[PDB]
Short mmCIF file of C-alpha atoms in Angstrom, two decimals:
data_model
loop_
_atom_site.label_atom_id
_atom_site.label_comp_id
_atom_site.label_asym_id
_atom_site.label_seq_id
_atom_site.Cartn_x
_atom_site.Cartn_y
_atom_site.Cartn_z
CA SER A 1 96.37 136.22 102.02
CA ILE A 2 96.07 133.24 99.87
CA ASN A 3 93.47 132.69 96.90
CA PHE A 4 94.65 130.02 94.22
CA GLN A 5 92.47 128.98 91.53
CA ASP A 6 93.44 126.22 89.02
CA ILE A 7 97.08 126.69 90.43
CA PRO A 8 99.09 123.49 90.42
CA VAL A 9 100.04 122.27 94.01
CA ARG A 10 103.78 122.79 93.19
CA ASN A 11 103.04 126.58 92.66
CA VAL A 12 101.25 127.14 95.97
CA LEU A 13 103.91 124.88 97.78
CA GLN A 14 106.58 127.28 96.28
CA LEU A 15 104.67 130.39 97.33
CA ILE A 16 104.45 128.91 100.93
CA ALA A 17 108.10 128.37 100.91
CA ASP A 18 109.13 131.70 99.53
CA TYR A 19 106.73 133.46 102.23
CA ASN A 20 109.83 133.39 104.57
CA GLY A 21 108.96 129.73 105.56
CA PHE A 22 111.68 126.90 105.72
CA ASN A 23 112.69 125.87 102.12
CA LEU A 24 110.82 123.12 100.88
CA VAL A 25 110.90 120.96 97.61
CA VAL A 26 108.90 118.77 95.50
CA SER A 27 108.89 115.65 93.20
CA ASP A 28 108.43 115.94 89.38
CA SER A 29 104.81 115.06 89.16
CA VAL A 30 103.62 115.14 92.76
CA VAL A 31 99.96 115.88 93.27
CA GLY A 32 98.59 118.27 90.46
CA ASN A 33 96.40 121.20 90.72
CA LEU A 34 93.80 122.70 93.19
CA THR A 35 91.82 125.66 94.25
CA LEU A 36 91.07 127.38 97.49
CA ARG A 37 91.15 130.59 99.36
CA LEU A 38 92.10 131.32 103.06
CA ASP A 39 93.73 134.14 104.97
CA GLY A 40 94.71 135.07 108.56
CA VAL A 41 95.73 131.49 109.91
CA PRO A 42 98.88 129.65 110.85
CA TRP A 43 100.79 127.71 108.33
CA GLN A 44 100.39 124.47 110.22
CA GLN A 45 96.63 124.18 109.91
CA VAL A 46 96.34 125.04 106.41
CA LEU A 47 99.22 123.04 105.15
CA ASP A 48 98.20 120.19 107.17
CA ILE A 49 94.41 120.16 105.95
CA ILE A 50 95.78 120.35 102.51
CA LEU A 51 98.14 117.44 102.82
CA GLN A 52 95.29 115.43 104.60
CA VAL A 53 92.47 116.08 102.16
CA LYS A 54 94.19 116.00 98.69
CA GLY A 55 97.89 116.86 99.27
CA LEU A 56 100.49 114.29 99.90
CA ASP A 57 103.10 113.52 102.70
CA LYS A 58 106.17 115.45 103.91
CA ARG A 59 109.36 114.83 105.58
CA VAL A 60 111.82 117.17 107.34
CA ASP A 61 115.60 116.44 107.25
CA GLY A 62 116.53 118.72 110.08
CA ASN A 63 116.46 122.07 108.16
CA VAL A 64 114.37 121.84 104.84
CA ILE A 65 111.35 119.87 104.07
CA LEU A 66 110.45 117.54 101.02
CA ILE A 67 107.14 116.55 99.69
CA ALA A 68 105.95 113.64 97.99
CA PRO A 69 103.19 110.95 97.69
CA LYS A 70 102.86 108.50 100.33
CA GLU A 71 103.33 105.72 97.94
CA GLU A 72 107.00 106.48 96.98
CA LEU A 73 107.51 107.13 100.73
CA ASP A 74 106.18 103.57 101.72
CA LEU A 75 107.85 102.01 98.84
CA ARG A 76 111.18 103.44 99.91
CA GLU A 77 110.85 102.40 103.44
CA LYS A 78 109.83 98.64 102.24
CA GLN A 79 112.90 98.65 99.90
CA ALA A 80 115.16 99.93 102.94
CA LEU A 81 113.71 97.17 105.12
CA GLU A 82 114.19 94.50 102.76
CA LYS A 83 117.70 95.50 101.96
CA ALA A 84 118.63 95.43 105.68
CA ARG A 85 116.76 92.04 106.28
CA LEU A 86 118.56 90.30 103.24
CA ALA A 87 121.95 91.69 104.19
CA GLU A 88 121.78 90.75 107.61
CA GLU A 89 120.71 87.21 106.26
CA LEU A 90 123.36 86.33 103.72
CA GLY A 91 126.48 87.74 104.82
CA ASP A 92 130.04 86.57 105.18
CA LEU A 93 130.72 85.05 108.56
CA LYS A 94 133.57 85.42 110.82
CA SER A 95 135.02 83.14 113.50
CA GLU A 96 136.91 84.04 116.59
CA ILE A 97 137.43 83.39 120.39
CA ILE A 98 136.26 85.35 123.34
CA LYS A 99 138.17 84.68 126.80
CA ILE A 100 136.11 84.75 129.86
CA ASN A 101 137.08 85.67 133.39
CA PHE A 102 135.29 85.52 136.73
CA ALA A 103 132.41 83.49 135.24
CA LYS A 104 131.96 79.93 133.76
CA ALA A 105 131.94 79.95 130.01
CA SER A 106 129.30 77.05 130.01
CA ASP A 107 127.02 79.13 131.72
CA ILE A 108 127.37 82.07 129.34
CA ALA A 109 127.23 79.73 126.25
CA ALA A 110 123.88 78.60 127.75
CA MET A 111 122.41 81.81 128.19
CA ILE A 112 123.63 83.61 124.98
CA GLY A 113 122.63 80.64 122.51
CA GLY A 114 120.86 77.68 123.95
CA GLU A 115 117.68 75.69 123.01
CA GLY A 116 116.11 76.62 119.81
CA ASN A 117 116.94 79.62 117.47
CA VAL A 118 113.98 82.15 118.59
CA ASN A 119 115.69 82.34 122.07
CA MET A 120 119.24 82.59 120.69
CA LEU A 121 120.69 85.97 120.10
CA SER A 122 121.96 84.67 116.70
CA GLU A 123 120.82 84.21 112.98
CA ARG A 124 122.92 81.26 111.23
CA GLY A 125 126.04 81.05 113.63
CA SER A 126 126.62 79.28 116.90
CA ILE A 127 128.89 79.39 120.15
CA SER A 128 131.30 76.61 121.24
CA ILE A 129 132.94 75.96 124.52
CA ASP A 130 136.53 75.39 125.21
CA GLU A 131 136.67 74.19 128.68
CA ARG A 132 140.37 73.71 129.32
CA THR A 133 141.07 77.50 128.89
CA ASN A 134 137.65 78.86 129.68
CA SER A 135 136.90 80.33 126.43
CA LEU A 136 134.16 80.78 123.69
CA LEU A 137 134.36 80.20 120.10
CA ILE A 138 131.64 82.10 118.10
CA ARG A 139 131.13 82.26 114.29
CA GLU A 140 128.78 85.14 113.32
CA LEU A 141 128.30 88.49 111.48
CA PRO A 142 130.89 90.83 112.19
CA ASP A 143 128.53 93.11 113.54
CA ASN A 144 126.84 90.92 116.16
CA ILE A 145 130.19 90.01 117.50
CA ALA A 146 130.55 93.56 118.71
CA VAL A 147 127.25 93.68 120.65
CA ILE A 148 127.84 90.26 122.12
CA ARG A 149 131.29 91.19 123.26
CA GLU A 150 130.14 94.33 124.73
CA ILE A 151 127.32 92.47 126.69
CA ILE A 152 129.32 89.73 127.89
CA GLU A 153 132.08 92.00 128.79
CA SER B 1 67.14 129.85 104.22
CA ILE B 2 68.26 127.02 101.82
CA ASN B 3 66.79 126.16 98.40
CA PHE B 4 69.27 124.67 96.09
CA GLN B 5 67.81 122.58 93.00
CA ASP B 6 70.65 121.03 90.75
CA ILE B 7 73.52 122.30 92.92
CA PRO B 8 76.57 120.39 93.46
CA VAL B 9 77.12 118.94 96.76
CA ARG B 10 80.38 121.04 96.73
CA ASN B 11 78.45 124.29 96.28
CA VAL B 12 76.06 123.66 99.30
CA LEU B 13 78.74 122.48 101.42
CA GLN B 14 80.80 125.89 100.58
CA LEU B 15 77.51 127.65 101.46
CA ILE B 16 77.15 126.01 104.84
CA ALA B 17 80.68 126.74 105.36
CA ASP B 18 80.45 130.58 104.60
CA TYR B 19 77.52 130.85 106.72
CA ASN B 20 79.63 131.52 109.69
CA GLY B 21 80.22 127.86 110.45
CA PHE B 22 83.55 126.26 110.94
CA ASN B 23 85.57 126.26 107.74
CA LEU B 24 85.25 122.96 105.66
CA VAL B 25 87.06 121.57 102.61
CA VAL B 26 86.20 118.40 100.31
CA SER B 27 87.90 116.19 97.82
CA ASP B 28 87.92 116.94 94.24
CA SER B 29 85.01 114.74 93.05
CA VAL B 30 83.29 113.91 96.36
CA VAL B 31 79.57 113.18 95.79
CA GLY B 32 78.00 114.97 92.76
CA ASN B 33 74.87 117.06 92.54
CA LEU B 34 71.45 117.19 94.49
CA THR B 35 68.21 119.36 95.30
CA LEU B 36 66.52 120.00 98.37
CA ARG B 37 64.96 123.10 100.30
CA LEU B 38 64.79 123.57 104.11
CA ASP B 39 64.71 126.53 106.62
CA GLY B 40 64.75 127.32 110.20
CA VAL B 41 66.56 124.35 111.47
CA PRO B 42 69.95 123.15 112.98
CA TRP B 43 72.81 122.76 110.93
CA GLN B 44 73.39 119.41 112.93
CA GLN B 45 69.99 117.89 111.84
CA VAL B 46 70.11 118.88 107.83
CA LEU B 47 73.89 118.10 107.54
CA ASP B 48 73.50 114.75 109.03
CA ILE B 49 70.52 113.63 107.20
CA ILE B 50 72.25 115.04 103.94
CA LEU B 51 75.43 112.92 104.99
CA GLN B 52 73.32 109.92 105.80
CA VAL B 53 71.06 109.75 102.86
CA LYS B 54 73.23 110.62 99.98
CA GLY B 55 76.08 112.64 101.61
CA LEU B 56 79.38 111.18 102.60
CA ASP B 57 81.34 111.22 105.60
CA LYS B 58 83.40 113.87 107.49
CA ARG B 59 86.01 114.32 109.98
CA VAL B 60 87.27 116.97 112.19
CA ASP B 61 90.58 117.70 113.12
CA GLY B 62 90.04 120.06 116.13
CA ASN B 63 89.05 123.19 114.38
CA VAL B 64 87.96 122.70 110.76
CA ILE B 65 86.03 120.05 109.12
CA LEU B 66 86.78 117.57 106.02
CA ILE B 67 84.61 115.88 103.96
CA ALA B 68 84.85 112.60 101.70
CA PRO B 69 83.58 109.37 100.76
CA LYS B 70 83.49 106.52 103.32
CA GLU B 71 85.48 104.36 100.87
CA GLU B 72 88.52 106.45 101.08
CA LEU B 73 88.36 106.90 104.67
CA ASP B 74 88.23 103.14 105.39
CA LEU B 75 90.93 102.43 102.63
CA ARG B 76 93.30 104.92 104.42
CA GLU B 77 92.55 103.44 107.77
CA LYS B 78 93.27 99.86 106.47
CA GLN B 79 96.40 101.30 104.76
CA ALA B 80 97.37 102.74 108.12
CA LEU B 81 96.72 99.64 110.03
CA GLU B 82 98.54 97.24 107.60
CA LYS B 83 101.65 99.41 107.76
CA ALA B 84 101.67 99.51 111.47
CA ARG B 85 101.24 95.80 111.71
CA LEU B 86 104.06 95.17 109.00
CA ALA B 87 106.45 97.54 110.54
CA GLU B 88 106.09 96.03 113.91
CA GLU B 89 106.47 92.53 112.29
CA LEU B 90 109.54 93.03 110.31
CA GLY B 91 111.75 95.28 112.32
CA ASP B 92 115.34 95.50 113.42
CA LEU B 93 115.90 93.90 116.76
CA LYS B 94 118.10 95.12 119.56
CA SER B 95 119.68 93.12 122.66
CA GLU B 96 120.40 94.35 126.05
CA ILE B 97 120.30 93.44 129.80
CA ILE B 98 117.97 94.43 132.58
CA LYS B 99 119.26 94.31 135.88
CA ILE B 100 116.60 93.23 138.73
CA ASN B 101 116.69 93.91 142.29
CA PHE B 102 114.31 92.97 145.22
CA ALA B 103 112.70 90.07 143.18
CA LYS B 104 113.98 86.79 141.60
CA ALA B 105 114.69 87.18 137.67
CA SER B 106 113.57 83.59 137.13
CA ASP B 107 109.92 84.51 138.24
CA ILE B 108 109.85 87.58 136.26
CA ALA B 109 111.22 85.81 133.31
CA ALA B 110 108.27 83.15 133.47
CA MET B 111 105.74 86.06 133.83
CA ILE B 112 106.92 88.20 130.89
CA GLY B 113 107.72 85.18 128.41
CA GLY B 114 106.62 81.90 129.19
CA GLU B 115 104.47 78.79 127.64
CA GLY B 116 103.59 79.80 123.98
CA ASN B 117 103.73 82.84 122.01
CA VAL B 118 100.19 83.92 122.50
CA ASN B 119 100.71 84.37 126.34
CA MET B 120 104.07 86.10 125.88
CA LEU B 121 104.23 89.95 125.75
CA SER B 122 106.59 89.54 122.73
CA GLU B 123 106.25 89.09 118.76
CA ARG B 124 109.78 87.40 117.59
CA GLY B 125 112.14 88.05 120.72
CA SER B 126 112.94 86.23 123.65
CA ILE B 127 114.04 86.57 127.28
CA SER B 128 117.01 84.85 129.01
CA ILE B 129 117.94 84.44 132.59
CA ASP B 130 121.55 85.12 133.99
CA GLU B 131 121.34 83.69 137.67
CA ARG B 132 124.96 84.48 138.62
CA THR B 133 124.11 88.31 138.59
CA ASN B 134 120.49 88.20 138.90
CA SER B 135 119.67 89.81 135.44
CA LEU B 136 117.47 89.40 132.23
CA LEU B 137 118.83 89.63 128.64
CA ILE B 138 116.29 90.43 126.17
CA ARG B 139 116.09 90.75 122.44
CA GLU B 140 113.21 92.51 120.94
CA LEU B 141 111.99 95.55 119.12
CA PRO B 142 113.42 98.79 120.74
CA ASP B 143 109.85 99.95 121.29
CA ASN B 144 108.57 97.03 123.30
CA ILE B 145 111.84 97.24 125.55
CA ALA B 146 110.58 100.69 126.99
CA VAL B 147 107.34 99.27 128.11
CA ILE B 148 108.57 96.17 129.45
CA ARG B 149 111.34 98.23 131.27
CA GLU B 150 108.78 100.35 132.88
CA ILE B 151 106.37 97.63 134.03
CA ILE B 152 109.13 95.49 135.56
CA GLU B 153 110.54 98.62 137.06
CA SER C 1 42.70 113.52 99.84
CA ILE C 2 45.12 111.76 97.51
CA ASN C 3 45.14 110.55 93.80
CA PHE C 4 48.17 110.56 92.11
CA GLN C 5 48.69 108.77 88.76
CA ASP C 6 52.03 108.48 86.93
CA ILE C 7 53.60 110.42 90.07
CA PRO C 8 56.88 109.65 91.03
CA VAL C 9 57.39 108.16 94.45
CA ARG C 10 59.58 111.07 95.27
CA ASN C 11 56.78 113.56 94.38
CA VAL C 12 54.04 111.81 96.41
CA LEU C 13 56.63 111.43 99.38
CA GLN C 14 57.19 115.30 99.15
CA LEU C 15 53.65 115.90 99.34
CA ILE C 16 53.16 113.52 102.43
CA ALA C 17 56.13 115.64 103.79
CA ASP C 18 54.66 119.12 103.03
CA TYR C 19 51.38 117.99 104.50
CA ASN C 20 52.48 119.13 108.19
CA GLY C 21 54.00 115.71 108.68
CA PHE C 22 57.69 115.27 110.18
CA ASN C 23 60.06 116.31 107.45
CA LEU C 24 61.46 113.60 105.31
CA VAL C 25 63.92 113.08 102.60
CA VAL C 26 64.75 110.52 99.96
CA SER C 27 67.94 109.41 97.85
CA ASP C 28 68.56 110.27 94.27
CA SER C 29 66.90 107.42 92.27
CA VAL C 30 64.98 105.70 95.11
CA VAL C 31 62.15 103.93 93.84
CA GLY C 32 60.50 105.47 90.80
CA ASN C 33 56.96 106.05 89.80
CA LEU C 34 53.41 104.63 90.83
CA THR C 35 49.76 105.36 90.86
CA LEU C 36 46.95 105.03 93.42
CA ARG C 37 44.02 107.09 95.08
CA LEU C 38 43.03 106.97 98.76
CA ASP C 39 41.53 109.65 101.27
CA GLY C 40 40.39 109.79 104.86
CA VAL C 41 42.91 107.49 106.51
CA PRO C 42 45.93 107.69 108.83
CA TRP C 43 49.37 108.33 107.25
CA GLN C 44 50.60 105.29 109.21
CA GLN C 45 48.38 102.74 107.00
CA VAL C 46 48.97 104.39 103.88
CA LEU C 47 52.53 104.98 104.31
CA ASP C 48 53.18 101.35 105.39
CA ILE C 49 51.10 99.65 103.03
#
């Protein structure tokens, strides 16, 4: 039951929203204007063909839908990835000791660390062995300590 | 039954659409204008000769057809490929252990990883062996872990 | 039976088309204009030359 000529994309999207569909929101200046007429069809096909040809991309948070251009979405993703990578690179390190029983600590230190950094499950720390008491002494990010501890337990 | 002189490509395409063919849509400023006259022929030959000589390219989503210049299509494809390659390059790694039975873990670690990175089925992780309990310890993207797990199972 | 002076290439090509030959189409601004006259010959030789 749709026929929109020289209607902004925001307005037709708000119509699709207010038509008993799940609530959706858009950006400030998202796409612009368009013109088309269709009826007697699912929202899936029409919405997707719009968002493919001229329309932008959309994401669902579980309940409601948001629309935006792909440029801002990819920019936000790249920002988040770079933030994660840099925060995991330059962090504050912590040092502590892990007690081992039923296995030799030298074998475990050779498996967790070892030759070269590509194999190592570490970034800019380091394992050492204490043979007298069968223990490991590790210096790394306080987030990698927990996964290492769970695995070697 | 077609004779269109100084008729925009959008208008003749909307005519071909409204002629009981499968619904089709175009971009904002796709091709432009043209002029030709033909009759008593299949839509396949006429549509293809138009889209070859001056017309642009088209894609079908299963039900309806979309038209656009080849430049935007190739640009979209290159964007998608670059996004996939960069996301698979710089991802967050995960580390976990795979238990092996009926085969030696050293042989399997030599087959899955091995000499050089070209042979390896990995990108910027790594296998290690734990001989005491016949196990592998892998650090890679949480998407490659599933295929590796299925194969070595 | 052809004699075209200052006739665009599009027009002589549409003539060769509408002369019971197989349908042909051209681009927007393909070649331009020309002038020549010939008769009693195959379409192959004239079209190719």
